[PDB]
Every structure is written in structure tokens, then in C-alpha cells.
């Protein structure tokens, strides 16, 4: 039950019969039953920040008066 | 058993590891979440809301109120500056307080564009024209209107819409700009001058403040993260 | 076409209304409108009770007064409509109960004066105390003021007497009352009344904590905090003053755990 | 500096109680394990310790007639001295720690302590 | 969709413009804040943008372990009269400040925390005597089991908390533990209190701190040296270091600007200026 | 297509020529250099090419780890009034000469860095007592982070910066670094300065050193002895060595003739000489 | 995921029903979500020198004169 | 856990060891290469250009 | 001969492309020939009380009278 | 063998573990379990079992 | 099948009652 996920790879070495290229691969396997054990997986989400900058009831168009 | 050999970091503690860890509590009945409003996800997001700026941070100004408001006049026109600012967000005193400086605080690098927005909160008589500005850094900072004019810049007509915003555009030679007072990764120069003079009628108070906010926009990013200097413990 | 506008609004809920002519659109928090408790979310068992239009209407705190000299105030939530009608009433009957909330700061003045007012919806907004011998030392009825809320000063003076210390809070304004700086408030949802451009400041907040429901006499989820950010100024008179009014309006607030009713030391 | 002040002492006779008192000047953002001990001749003892609260921890000859308490807020200890015994003629004093539950004669200051006679018949 | 990882928008080439479209003129009455790109307020090229948010994920950012407390052993002479060597703490994060500030950025939080411990040791007076590698023993007691009375008694057996016996010398102790809040979600802060004060009831009966509550007991730990007295005197150091893996966060705070003053929000006459002189007009 | 390890081209047999073509013959002021093969000049035979470069790529070339600084600690008499015990340097690769030589081989360069770290101690003053194992703590300070004041402050709580807590007498530590670069590659020279000196200024207002800029700051790393002190004085070192993986290179250069001397191109007074004395007409 | 490559085989031992012979590989499993904490490929490319060599404009043809 | 058995070479820091190791500053945003003329990828190319020989190196 | 079950997650990573969501298993081997060696799996049973509760001859009903 | 680096946490004792151990005594022939009466499954069985309480704690 | 990681029983939602059901009354005496 492994689990194979691609790294973003930034420095490149001169390879692309091995390394640097054809994408690098990293595996993980959970060893313990509690999920609590697991490392950080680190594959996050982003979001629209909406709901802290533009939290008015009325959709804000940026071309437009604010007010109107 | 299997053969195995240790290699070099074998042991170590390194505190920016990411390794599973036998868990202390097993088959332990953890509480399900609920769906709590204002989930943040990135610190960026908070990077990207306004936040005022203490700009008047006068000797009597400084840790009072007073260090928000930055006070125009119905005087005649003059090419003398209203303010004055360095674009370094995490280092110059007037950026480094506000929510981006301080995220910003927490990393060495910075990079992206930012954007200063400017309410005027004087009475709906009086009337107005200002020019924001930013130079980018290499040649004397802008000291005159004449300067100013030069570089980028947004004339604001103070009018209905009570408030302008000024894009700092992302203009610099490395990809990254340190996160403290640096030369080679230095910003430039923000400032705010009178285009034409604020004009009231009679029975007005004739003189009013400005408040300034400070944000990122959605190119905005930061990098490698360190410990902040602005918390400590003694002892 | 037909002149709709951000400025213009109307609320109405239960049997009162509310409109005004000078808004700034409004601000619904965290982008949440207020909900009721969801079976998937729920927690006491008990069939709940909801008051609906019995308490979910608008209610009109005691108005303060605005001057030169004003470093702000603030106020809690249920707390400060713990007086209320049957809001009040459910509110000491039940040992849990959950509300969300339509506050409605207003204040007008005139073209010729100036100013402008942050009125900050904080959730969890714990304030400062006033000694420096003992932390987290005020009292149940200074922390709870109801309808007539506390205010903010110009400077921390730490309370001395150790025999019979105050006990209340002595929250500094530029610190927010709670030690950090005021000019990031504005990461709470919230809006500024500005005087040459409205008259009134409105912010729909969702009901916030750690739990589904809690209990209302002993926890205020939201604080709201209205400090002035640029100061009072009309026409060149020494001492204006124009006053500020808050109207606030629960909603889908529901209540479990009823027994005999509460009654709180106060004083 | 940080300065702890001792008060309540007095001379009592046997049989008798006390109840000593110990607040700091200032609030310590630090210590919240408090102290107390005692002296005769040329060697300190331990009488108790309390941290927070309600952990408290006594000696093997103060146990069952010493109670510590202390305020979970202020930082401040007190000490309840019952069905007093001649041998407990000493000089009390206070030590703030950081988190100490354990006792040992090694604090930085010393304040100035309590004196506590005890009178026989 | 949009992982941490991705590359950020692209800046799109925009020219002059001169019309009745406004994006530089807004109103910051209304609460929200202007959504700006360059090309609204300037002329821009075209730019592919390659930088990523990836290490300001609320993840990455508290990827760092850090210390909380410094607990501490002792011993004397012989006995002489004294038995009470082991050390227990409160857990609490709230007794440094680096940590604590980090956390406070937000109002709620959830997280799986590990548990990592550095354990140092020393020589205390010039001696020819040699101690032999010892053996320590970390004990979570819960809130509500026994807490240790003497060095030896019967709670060290440690039939149900789970204890950690860490050997001098090899790699530092570690432990996972769950989210174990009693809400669906850890109270940084919490306005209000524990107890109602009723007024048919005397004012201490109904007295309780501000800000205080059962969301944030979690009990103690318990450390001492297993060995056996040893002629030579051997004091010991456990550093804990927390960090909170699996996180999410709730309601954005401004950060602490004044130095902290106890578990609360309170703060200290002398302490309130974290802005220094700077003139108005001058870069 | 062509790999590292693959094998050089044959040479090819060749007999005796007569003819226009002149290989031979060439012009050096044009900035080629001639292209020339055994065959072009002598007759050659068929020769099935083995060889290969394989251990001349530029990864294989910077395969070794490389020595960098030597920190060290103190302890006194006791305290006296000495409690500055902890060691912060400056990181940069220039301090040696073996791989500073190695990197100026070539202009630019991108590459991940691995550090280890081999750390020894030892008693000073010949004494009975007897020292517990250590261990130690590596904090990388990048950039802006407050640096340490005293051996116990704040500091060294580290809720952000990465640190290695180093067991003394198991497997030296290592760790791996990105690029870190604010540019898209290190720049082993820079011809320049990261100030402009104007005219409307002073003259000191606008003065900074030939050839450095920010683009080689990277902040420092402070070592500490975590266990506390002893009243056997024990010094230790850490020796940093560093190995550039994944790496590129650009722009040739001519390899450092004379002895280095500062972070800079300086060169000292007296080691100008790098040639001996050898005649024109001597074997 | 683990990755296979082949060695570069130099000593042969007396074998080839195992070692020597049969092509002999070797095998890589990443461990790590960063792609700098992996080990160096080694597997690099190889290119013309003549951008350093012959940098000239007109292209050289050795068998001609260098000047015309 | 799995059975294991010490090899010799254990422990010991081989300079021109290849072996992968936990990187200090994980999620880092590293900034992205540009084509900056002139990459050398093996050392003998520099080998074939043609330097300058110092033939007379007699005392003055 | 690898075991893989699932884990039961309760506290989610800002994840669904890695942990969190994706159903997040564990992978378990045995390594000795002797079952008591094996560690717990911790994937256990529940029974109704009943045995204890309402070791009653004749079913009881609820809603009925118990004594009827 | 096998190139492997140590974790922090290796040789400690967590007394709330759970991993494999080796046996002291291989081979043995385990009796077989009987179906007696009354097996648990889960102490909240015995939770839900009716007892009595003891309401009158007066000094007598 | 019920393993004991699952869930609890759910509540139902229950309105009033009035009827001959009496699931309150009980006998002890039996052993249940
Ligand atoms: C020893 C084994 C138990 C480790 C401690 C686990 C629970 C501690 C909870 C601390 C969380 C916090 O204060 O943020
Ligand atoms: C301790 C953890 C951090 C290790 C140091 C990483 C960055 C140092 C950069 C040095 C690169 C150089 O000077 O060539």
C-alpha cells in the first residue's frame, strides 16, 4: 500500500535519463495504524481570499463605482 | 535480519523533519469538526486585506492613536512632500507593524506587487487633488512634486468615492528582495504630495486626515521562513 | 434604472424595520449567513426551541455620545442584549444557546463635519485587565456590562489597591484592548463610518466558536468594538457632538437545556 | 528587583495555629511554583511546595498540620499552620520557582522570612 | 483545485486606457479591499509567473517544532531529609513566547501534535565520582489520575498513562498524539468564564478567572530519573518541543505587539510601545 | 543524447595524403581553437575508443564534501563573570581556500546543498571529573532572525528557524538545503556594488564595498552545548562540510593563480609568484 | 515507485548467471517530499565544446583555411 | 519492527558518499533557472580550448 | 504478503490529494512465524449487551409492562 | 546493506506501543479457546448494566 | 459486523406522546 507522489523539482541536476527530467517520483508508506502517526503530507489547497478582503453582501466589481 | 547500514544524520533531531512517530493515544475517539467560519488556508490570504499604517511616528505621535493619521491642511500649494516612505515592508518602521509586515517578519525573502490605499476623512465640503507616488529606487529620493511626477504615480480627485489605491507594481532586479534594510535588494521610495490644494468653504474645519492601508495583491509571495524579532522573552 | 442603489437599504426582521440612505453596501462576516444548528453538527439532544420572531428582531441599546475626547467603546455579545425581550428571557432559561446577529451601528452628522468611526466585530474579543499583580483577574460583572458597554481609554493605569483590587478591564486603544496594534483590526470583519460618506455601518456575523453550541451566560462569542479612527471635527466649534446608536438583531438563534431561570450576580 | 515579602509570623504557644502569608511586589510572568522554608541553627528546610493549583506537596513532619494554598491568579502562597509543636520555632520564607514541584535549597534571592516561636507550657 | 504549490497568475500585457472604468477609485467603508492587479493602474507586460505560495501554507508555516518548557531534577547530600526528586509540569504553550505568538494569529485551531524530547544532563561539584548511563521516565497523566507523591510510590507503575522511558544517549524521545480537544476545535482565546456568579450564592462560590476553561486542561507531565541515588550528584534537563502537524485554522487575529503577561491577553505597565521614532517626511 | 559515461570517439585509420586540404594550418586570432585529430596530422590506425569522461561531468567533479569552519566553545573558571558561552558564524563558502578554489573555476552556479557536520570535543586541564555525554544544538539564523545574546535567552527556543540537536558520538548530522538564491543562480563574482553613490549625497552616505551585494547573505549559524554547565571545562568543534549536488555551472574562468586574500579578487603584496624557474631550452 | 538504472559494469567478476554478465542494475527509492534531499543521479549529459571552442560567426571547416 | 542487522560501515562519513538526507527548509519556493549563456557540463570542454603556455620561464 | 487497511481520520490536513481525503491506509507485515508475536490489530468487534443487560427468559418489550 | 537512517525516537520505550516482539517460546502448542459463558467485548457493555448507588453517605 | 470503530447510534427526532405505552414504568425484580 505505497504511496507514489511527484516532487517539484527546482534545482535540476544535468540528467534526463534519470534525474532532473522525466519526473521525480517520491514514495510513502504508512507504518502505524493511527492517523495521528502520519507525516504531513504537504499536498495543500489554496483558496479565493473573498471571504476576508470582499465580505460585502453585494459582489464588488473593480472596473465600477464602490459606491453606487 | 535485513543487512542494513547507518548513514550520516543518523539520530539527529532536526526540527524541520517530517517523519511518522509512534502515536501516544491509539484508537482514541477524536471529535469530528465542524464547518466554523473564516477558514484560513495560506497566510498570504491575510497578507492580501488592508491593514492601516502608522504613519506619523513623531516622537509624542509614536504608540498613541495619533501615529494613524496624517493631517492635510487647506494651505496654498506647495511641492513639499506630505509623507514620506520607504518600500520595505518588513523593515521600514511604518510597514513593518501592519499585518503584511508583520507575516513578512516571519520570512526572508518577499516578492510581488503591493498597493497603498488612501482614505480621506474630511468633511464631504471639502474638495482635493494629491499625488500619490513610487519611484524605484537607484537615484535621489523624491524630495519635490517635480520628482515624484517622474516615476509611478496615480493623481487622486477626492470626490464620492472617499478612497484611491496606487499599485506598487513589482519592479526589481532579483526575484526575491530580502526581508530586512538592504541595499542590493532595496524597494524604493513611496510618497504624497498636493496636486492642486484642498479647498473648503467657509464654516469647515480646515484641516482633516488621511489613513493609509497597506496590502498584497494576488502575485504576492514569501519565502523561507524565520523566527520574528518582534516578540521576545526575558529570562 | 429603477435607482437601486449600496447606499439605500431596508431591513426588516420579526416586526421591525430598519432603512437608511447613507449606507456602504454591508458586511455579511467570514462570508457565513447566519444558520440553524445542522443535524450532522448537532450536539445536546434535546428537542430545541426557537424563538424566531419572538427574538429574532431589532433591538435598540442605550445611545452614547461622540465628542473630541472619545477614545471608543465596545460591547459583548449576547451579553449586551441580555436585557432584551424574549431574546433575554430564552437566553436565562436554557443552559445552551446559539444566535447569530445583524448589528446596525448608526450615525449621522452633517457635510460640514468630519470624522470616521471603525466599528470592529471581533469573535472571542478578550480584553485586557487593569493590574499588574494578577492576570486574568476581572470579575463575571465587570467582564459583563449588558446594554451600556465599556469604553476604551488613552492609557494603561495599572490598579494599585491589592486590598480591594477594581477587577475591570482597562482596555488601551491603540492596543485593541488586548496587546496588539489597532491598525490591523481591520482583519475582523468590519466597515467605517466615515462621515462625508455614510451614516451607518451594518455587519451580518455568523454565529462563532469552537462548539456548536455553548452557553450564553458564561461565554460571549462576538465583540463589538467602535473606536475612532480619525477624530470628531465641526466647523471650527470646540466641542461637537453627535451621538452613535447600535441596533442589533439576533438571529436563528435556538436554545437547549431548559431548567428554572438563571439568575446572575450582576453588580 | 523581584521581591517576595513574609508576613503572619508570631509566637504562639503549643497546640496552638498561624497562617503565613507570602505575595510577591510585582506579578511574576514566570513562577508559578511557590515555597516555603524554615531554619533553626545553620541548616535550611523544606517545609512545602505548591505549584498552580491543587497540587501541593508536603514534608515528612509538617504533613497532616500545614496546609499550602496560594491564589490561582495572583502570585502569592499561604501557609496554615495547625496544632503547632515547639520544634516548629523557626524562621519561615518564600521562593517563587518556574516549575518545581520538587523542593531543594537553591533559589537565586532570599526575601527576609517570618519569625515563628513556639511556646511550650 | 488550486494547490499550494501552483505557480501564481501570470501578469498580463495591458496598454493605455482613457474611459469611464475606474479600478483605481474605491471605498474602504464598505470593508473590503480593492482587488488590484498592476495593469490596472499601469501599462505591463507579459509575464509568466513561476513563484509559488508554497511555504506559506498554514502547514508549512508551523512546520517548526519549538520549545515550550525546561523541566529540571535535583539531588542533595544523601537524604539528609529529602526524597522529593521528580519534576511535573502543566502542560501548557503558553510559558514561552515564540510559540505562543505563532499561534495566536488565529482564534481556532485543530491538529495532530508531536511531541519531541531533548534530555540533557550534568556534573554538579568537582568529583571523582562517575555516574552510569541513566534511564528517565515521562509520564502524561491525565487530569484526574494520581500525581506522583514521592519518588517511589505507586503511581509510577503506570498501568493506564502512557509513558515514555527514555535511555541517556540515543535519539531524543518522540510521540504523536491526536486532535484531543473536548471541542471541535482548540479555544486560543476564550472570552469568558468557567462559572456563573448566581446571586443567591455567596461571590466566591461563583468566582472564576476570565478567560479560563476546562477546552485547554490537558493535564500533566510527569519526569524522573529511574536509576537509583547515586553518590554523585546528577542534574537532568527535559526540553519539550511541540510541533503541530495536520493543522487547520480559524478566524484571523492581529498578532501580539506587546510583550506577553501571563495565560491571558492582559499586559504590563512599561511594555506598551512597539513602535519606535520615525519622522513623517523622511524615507 | 550523449551521457557522461559513454565512450570517446574511435580513431580511424588514415593514410598518407598529398593535397589542398590543410588541416594543419590554421589562425588563432579568429578566438577558435583548431579542431585537430591525430588523423589530420599523422597517419593513424583503427582504435576502438574506451575511455570515457565520466568522472569529469561537472557533478562528478564537485562530488566531494568540503571543509568550511572550525567553531568552537569555551568555559572558564566558573562563572566569574563569564556567560557567553556559543558560537555564531557567518556563513560563507570563502573563508577556506580548497573549495573556494573548486567554485571559481566557473562564473555561476545553482545547486542543493548538503551539510554535515563532524563534531569532537575534549577535556583541557588534566582532571578527575568526568563530563555526560553531550549535545548540541546547530540553529540556522537566516538573514533578519534576532541573533542569540546570551547562551540563555530566547533565542534559542526556535519556533521557526531550523536546528539540529546533535547527539555527541553517533553518525556526524546532515542536512539538505535548496537553491536558495534570490537570483536564478549564485553569482561567484559580482562586478558592482550595492550602492549608488549620488551626487545630492555624502560621500559616506553613499559608499559600499567593490563586489558585494546581498545576493551571497545568508545568514548565520549558531552552535550552543545544550546541557548546562559542568565543573569540567570541555571544548568541542563542529566542522561544516559542504557538497554541491544536483549542480550547474556557467561562464569559464581562469583558476585562482596566487593566494586568496579577503572574500574578494585582492591579492597580497609578495605572493605574485606563482611560476618557478625553469629554462627555454631544458627538457 | 522505484526507480531501476543500469551500472556501468568495469571489474567483472567470473560470472555471468548473476553478476558479470547479464546486465547488471541497481535500484533507487526516493524518500523525501524534496526533490534537494535526493541523492545525485549521476546519469548527466555530455555537449559539443564549441561554443567555447569555436565561437566564431562563420562556421570552421578544419580541412580549409581559417582566413579567406 | 523489521528484523535489522549492522552492517560494518555503519556510522561512518564517507566524503564521497551519495545518500539522500532530510532537507532543512521543506516547501521552499526555489526561484527558477533562466538560460544564462555559457553552461559547461563537463570539465573537459574547458580541457579543449586552447590556452596560453608560459614557455620561458627563466629567472628575470 | 503485505496487510493494507484503512485508517480511521480524524483530525484532516488541509489534504485531498495526498492525505485527508483520499482514504489514507496503512501497510502491516508480519515478520515472525509464532501469532503471539504479532502486534494488535486493534480491528475489533462489538456485541449488544443483552447477555448482561436483559438476561431475561422472556423478551422484553419496552414499551410494554415489564411485569405482565 | 541496506543504507538507513535513524529517526528520532529510536530506542525508546513507549509504553502505549504497538509493535512486533519475538518469542520466547516457538512452536508451542496453544491450548484452544471453550465458549464459556458471558464474553466482553467492550467495557461499556458493563457501563450499561444497572447499579445500585449509595445517595445516603452520611458520617453513619 | 458492528467493529468497534463505528459510530454510535443516531437520535430520531420525537414529538409528543400520549398513550398506553409506557416505556418509563419498569420492574427491577426481574434482573433487567
Ligand atoms: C507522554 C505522552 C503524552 C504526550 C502529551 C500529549 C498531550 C499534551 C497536549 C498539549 C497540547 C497543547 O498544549 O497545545
Ligand atoms: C542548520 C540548517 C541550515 C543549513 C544551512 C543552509 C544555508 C547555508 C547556505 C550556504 C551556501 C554557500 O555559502 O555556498
Known amino acids: 500500500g505505497a504511496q507514489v507522489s511527484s516532487q517539484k523539482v527546482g534545482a535540476h541536476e544535468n540528467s534526463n535519463r534519470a534525474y532532473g527530467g522525466s519526473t521525480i517520483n517520491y514514495t510513502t508508506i504508512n507504518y502505524y495504524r493511527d492517523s495521528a502517526s502520519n507525516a504531513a503530507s504537504k499536498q495543500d489547497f489554496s483558496q479565493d481570499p473573498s471571504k476576508f478582503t470582499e465580505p460585502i453582501k453585494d459582489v464588488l466589481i473593480k472596473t465600477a463605482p464602490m459606491l453606487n | 535480519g535485513l543487512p542494513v547500514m547507518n548513514t550520516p544524520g543518523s539520530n539527529q533531531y532536526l526540527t524541520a523533519d517530517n517523519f511518522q512517530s509512534p502515536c501516544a493515544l491509539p484508537e482514541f475517539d477524536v471529535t469530528p469538526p465542524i464547518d466554523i467560519p473564516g477558514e484560513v488556508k495560506n497566510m498570504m490570504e491575510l497578507a492580501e486585506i488592508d491593514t492601516m499604517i502608522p504613519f506619523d511616528l513623531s516622537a509624542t505621535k509614536k504608540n498613541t492613536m495619533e501615529m494613524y493619521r496624517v493631517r492635510l491642511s487647506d494651505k496654498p500649494h506647495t511641492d513639499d512632500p506630505i509623507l514620506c516612505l520607504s518600500l520595505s515592508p518588513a523593515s521600514d518602521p511604518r510597514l513593518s507593524h501592519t499585518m503584511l509586515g508583520e507575516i513578512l517578519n516571519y520570512y526572508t525573502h518577499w516578492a510581488g506587487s503591493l498597493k497603498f490605499t488612501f482614505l480621506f476623512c474630511g468633511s464631504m465640503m471639502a474638495t482635493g487633488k494629491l499625488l500619490v507616488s513610487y519611484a524605484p529606487p537607484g537615484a535621489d529620493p523624491p524630495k519635490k512634486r517635480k520628482e515624484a511626477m517622474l516615476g509611478t504615480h496615480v493623481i487622486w480627485d477626492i470626490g464620492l468615492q472617499s478612497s484611491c489605491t496606487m499599485v506598487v507594481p513589482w519592479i526589481s532586479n532579483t526575484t526575491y528582495r530580502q526581508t530586512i534594510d538592504d541595499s542590493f535588494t532595496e524597494g524604493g521610495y513611496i510618497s504624497v504630495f498636493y496636486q492642486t490644494r484642498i479647498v473648503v468653504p467657509l464654516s469647515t474645519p480646515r484641516e482633516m486626515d488621511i489613513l493609509g492601508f497597506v496590502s498584497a495583491c494576488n502575485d504576492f509571495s514569501v519565502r523561507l521562513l524565520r523566527d520574528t524579532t518582534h516578540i521576545e522573552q526575558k529570562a | 434604472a429603477c435607482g437601486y442603489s449600496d447606499r439605500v437599504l431596508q431591513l426588516t426582521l420579526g416586526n421591525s424595520t430598519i432603512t437608511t440612505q447613507e449606507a456602504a453596501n454591508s458586511v455579511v462576516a467570514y462570508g457565513r449567513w447566519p444558520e440553524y444548528l445542522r443535524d450532522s453538527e448537532a450536539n445536546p439532544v434535546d428537542q430545541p426551541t426557537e424563538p424566531d420572531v419572538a427574538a429574532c428582531r431589532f433591538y435598540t441599546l442605550d445611545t452614547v455620545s461622540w465628542t473630541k475626547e472619545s477614545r471608543g467603546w465596545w460591547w459583548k455579545l449576547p451579553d449586551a442584549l441580555r436585557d432584551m425581550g424574549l431574546f433575554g428571557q430564552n437566553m436565562y432559561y436554557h443552559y445552551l444557546g446559539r444566535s447569530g446577529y445583524t448589528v446596525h451601528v448608526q450615525c449621522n452628522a452633517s457635510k460640514f463635519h468630519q470624522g470616521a468611526l471603525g466599528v470592529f466585530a471581533v469573535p472571542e474579543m478578550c480584553l485586557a485587565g487593569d493590574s499588574n499583580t494578577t492576570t486574568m483577574h476581572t470579575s463575571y460583572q465587570n467582564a459583563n456590562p449588558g446594554e451600556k458597554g465599556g469604553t476604551f481609554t488613552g492609557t494603561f493605569t495599572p490598579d494599585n489597591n491589592q486590598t480591594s483590587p477594581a477587577r475591570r478591564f482597562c482596555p488601551v486603544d491603540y492596543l485593541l484592548g488586548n496587546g496588539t496594534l489597532l491598525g490591523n483590526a481591520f482583519v475582523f470583519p468590519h466597515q467605517i463610518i466615515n462621515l462625508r460618506t455614510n451614516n451607518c455601518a451594518t455587519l451580518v456575523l455568523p454565529y462563532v466558536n469552537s462548539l456548536s453550541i455553548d452557553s450564553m451566560v458564561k461565554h460571549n462569542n462576538w465583540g463589538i468594538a467602535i473606536l475612532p479612527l480619525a477624530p470628531l471635527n465641526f466647523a471650527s466649534e470646540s466641542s461637537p457632538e453627535i451621538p452613535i446608536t447600535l441596533t442589533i438583531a439576533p438571529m436563528c438563534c435556538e436554545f437547549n437545556g431548559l431548567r428554572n431561570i438563571t439568575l446572575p450576580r450582576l453588580q | 528587583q523581584v521581591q517576595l515579602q513574609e508576613s503572619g509570623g508570631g509566637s504562639v504557644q503549643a497546640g496552638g495555629s498561624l497562617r503565613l502569608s507570602c505575595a510577591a511586589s510585582?506579578?511574576?510572568?514566570?513562577?508559578?511554583?511557590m515555597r516555603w522554608f524554615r531554619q533553626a541553627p545553620k541548616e535550611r528546610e523544606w517545609v512545602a511546595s505548591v505549584?498552580?493549583?491543587?497540587?501541593?506537596w508536603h514534608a515528612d513532619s509538617v504533613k497532616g498540620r500545614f496546609t499550602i494554598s496560594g491564589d490561582n491568579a495572583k502570585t502569592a502562597a499561604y501557609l496554615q499552620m495547625n496544632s503547632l509543636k515547639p520544634e516548629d520555632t523557626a524562621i519561615y520564607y518564600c521562593?517563587?520557582?518556574?516549575?518545581?514541584?520538587?523542593?531543594?535549597?537553591?533559589?537565586?534571592?532570599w526575601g527576609q522570612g517570618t519569625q515563628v516561636t513556639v511556646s511550650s507550657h | 483545485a488550486a494547490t499550494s504549490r501552483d505557480a501564481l497568475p501570470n501578469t498580463e500585457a495591458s496598454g493605455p486606457t482613457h474611459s469611464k472604468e475606474i479600478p483605481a477609485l474605491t471605498a474602504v467603508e464598505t470593508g473590503a479591499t480593492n482587488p488590484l492587479v498592476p495593469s490596472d493602474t499601469v501599462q505591463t507586460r507579459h509575464v509568466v509567473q513561476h513563484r509559488s505560495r508554497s511555504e506559506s501554507s498554514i502547514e508549512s508555516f508551523f512546520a517548526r517544532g519549538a520549545c515550550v518548557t525546561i523541566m529540571t531534577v535535583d539531588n542533595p547530600a544523601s537524604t539528609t531529609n529529602k526524597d522529593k526528586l521528580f519534576a511535573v509540569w502543566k502542560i501548557t504553550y503558553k510559558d514561552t513566547v515564540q510559540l505562543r505568538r505563532k499561534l495566536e494569529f488565529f482564534t481556532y485551531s485543530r491538529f495532530d501534535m508531536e511531541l519531541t524530547f531533548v534530555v540533557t544532563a550534568n556534573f554538579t561539584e568537582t568529583n571523582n565520582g562517575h555516574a552510569l548511563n541513566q534511564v528517565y521516565q515521562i509520564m502524561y497523566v491525565p487530569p484526574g489520575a494520581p500525581v506522583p507523591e514521592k519518588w517511589d510510590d505507586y503511581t509510577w507503575q503506570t498501568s493506564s498513562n502512557p509513558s515514555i522511558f527514555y535511555t541517556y544517549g540515543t535519539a531524543p524521545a518522540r510521540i504523536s498524539v491526536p486532535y484531543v480537544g473536548i471541542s471541535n476545535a482548540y479555544s486560543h482565546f476564550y472570552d469568558g468564564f468557567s462559572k456563573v456568579p448566581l446571586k443567591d450564592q455567596s461571590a466566591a462560590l461563583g468566582d472564576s478567572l476570565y478567560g479560563a476553561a476546562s477546552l485547554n486542561d490537558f493535564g500533566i507531565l510527569a519526569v524522573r530519573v529511574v536509576n537509583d541515588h547515586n553518590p554523585t550528584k546528577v542534574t537532568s534537563k527535559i526540553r519539550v518541543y511541540l510541533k503541530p502537524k495536520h493543522i487547520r485554522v480559524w478566524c484571523p487575529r492581529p498578532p501580539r505587539a506587546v510583550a506577553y503577561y501571563g495565560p491571558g491577553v492582559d499586559y504590563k505597565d512599561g511594555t506598551l510601545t512597539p513602535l519606535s521614532t520615525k519622522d513623517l517626511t523622511t524615507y | 543524447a550523449a551521457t557522461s559515461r559513454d565512450a570517446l570517439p574511435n580513431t580511424e585509420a588514415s593514410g598518407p595524403t598529398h593535397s589542398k586540404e590543410i588541416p594543419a594550418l590554421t589562425a588563432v586570432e579568429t578566438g577558435a581553437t583548431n579542431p585537430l585529430v591525430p588523423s589530420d596530422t599523422v597517419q593513424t590506425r583503427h582504435v576502438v575508443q574506451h575511455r570515457s569522461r565520466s568522472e569529469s561531468s561537472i557533478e562528478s567533479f564537485f562530488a566531494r564534501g568540503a571543509c568550511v569552519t572550525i567553531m568552537t566553545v569555551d568555559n572558564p573558571a566558573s562563572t566569574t563573570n563569564k556567560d557567553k558561552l556559543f558560537a555564531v558564524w557567518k556563513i560563507t563558502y570563502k573563508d577556506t581556500v580548497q573549495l573556494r578554489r573548486k567554485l571559481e573555476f566557473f562564473t555561476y552556479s545553482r545547486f542543493d546543498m548538503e551539510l554535515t557536520f563532524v563534531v569532537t570535543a575534549n577535556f583541557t586541564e588534566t582532571n578527575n571529573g568526568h563530563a555526560l555525554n553531550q549535545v548540541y544544538q546547530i540553529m540556522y539564523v537566516p538573514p533578519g532572525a534576532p541573533v542569540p545574546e546570551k547562551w540563555d535567552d530566547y533565542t534559542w527556543q526556535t519556533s521557526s528557524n531550523p536546528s539540529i540537536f546533535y547527539t555527541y558520538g553517533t553518525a556526524p548530522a546532515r542536512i539538505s538545503v535548496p537553491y536558495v538564491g534570490i537570483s536564478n543562480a549564485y553569482s561567484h563574482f559580482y562586478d558592482g556594488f550595492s550602492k549608488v553613490p549620488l551626487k545630492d549625497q555624502s560621500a559616506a552616505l553613499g559608499d559600499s564595498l567593490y563586489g558585494a551585494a546581498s545576493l551571497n547573505d545568508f545568514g548565520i549559524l549558531a552552535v550552543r552545548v545544550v546541557n548546562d554547565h559542568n565543573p569540567t571545562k570541555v571544548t568541542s568543534k563542529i566542522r561544516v562540510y559542504l557538497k554541491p549536488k544536483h549542480i550547474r555551472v556557467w561562464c569559464p574562468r581562469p583558476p585562482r593563480a596566487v593566494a586568496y586574500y579577503g572574500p574578494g579578487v585582492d591579492y597580497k603584496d609578495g605572493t605574485l609568484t606563482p611560476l618557478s624557474t625553469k629554462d627555454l631550452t631544458t627538457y | 515507485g522505484a526507480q531501476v538504472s543500469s551500472q556501468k559494469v568495469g571489474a567483472h567478476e567470473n560470472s555471468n548467471r548473476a553478476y558479470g554478465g547479464s546486465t547488471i542494475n541497481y535500484t533507487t527509492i526516493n524518500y523525501y517530499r524534496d526533490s534537494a534531499s535526493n541523492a545525485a543521479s549521476k546519469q548527466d549529459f555530455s555537449q559539443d565544446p564549441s561554443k567555447f571552442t569555436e565561437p566564431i560567426k562563420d562556421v570552421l571547416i578544419k580541412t580549409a583555411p581559417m582566413l579567406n | 519492527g523489521l528484523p535489522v542487522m549492522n552492517t560494518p560501515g555503519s556510522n561512518q562519513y564517507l566524503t564521497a558518499d551519495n545518500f539522500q538526507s532530510p532537507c532543512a527548509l521543506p516547501e521552499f519556493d526555489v526561484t527558477p533557472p533562466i538560460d544564462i549563456p555559457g553552461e559547461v557540463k563537463n570539465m573537459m570542454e574547458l580541457a579543449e580550448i586552447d590556452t596560453m603556455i608560459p614557455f620561458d620561464l627563466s629567472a628575470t | 504478503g503485505a496487510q493494507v487497511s484503512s485508517q480511521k481520520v480524524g483530525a484532516h490536513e488541509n489534504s485531498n490529494r495526498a492525505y485527508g481525503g483520499s482514504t489514507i491506509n496503512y501497510t502491516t507485515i508480519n515478520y515472525y512465524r509464532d501469532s503471539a508475536s504479532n502486534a494488535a490489530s486493534k480491528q475489533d468487534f462489538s456485541q449488544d449487551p443483552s447477555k448482561f443487560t436483559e438476561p431475561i427468559k422472556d423478551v422484553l418489550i419496552k414499551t410494554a409492562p415489564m411485569l405482565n | 546493506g541496506l543504507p538507513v537512517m535513524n529517526t528520532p525516537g529510536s530506542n525508546q520505550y513507549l509504553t502505549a506501543d504497538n509493535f512486533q516482539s519475538p518469542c520466547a517460546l516457538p512452536e508451542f502448542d496453544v491450548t484452544p479457546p471453550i465458549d464459556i459463558p458471558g464474553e466482553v467485548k467492550n467495557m461499556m457493555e458493563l457501563a450499561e448494566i444497572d447499579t445500585m448507588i449509595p445517595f445516603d453517605l452520611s458520617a453513619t | 459486523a458492528a467493529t468497534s470503530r463505528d459510530a454510535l447510534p443516531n437520535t430520531e427526532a420525537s414529538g409528543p406522546t400520549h398513550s398506553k405505552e409506557i416505556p418509563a414504568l419498569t420492574a427491577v425484580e426481574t434482573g433487567a
Open positions: 521562593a517563587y520557582s518556574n516549575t518545581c514541584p520538587g523542593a531543594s535549597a537553591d533559589f537565586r534571592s
Open positions: 510585582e506579578y511574576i510572568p514566570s513562577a508559578n511554583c
Open positions: 505549584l498552580r493549583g491543587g497540587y501541593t
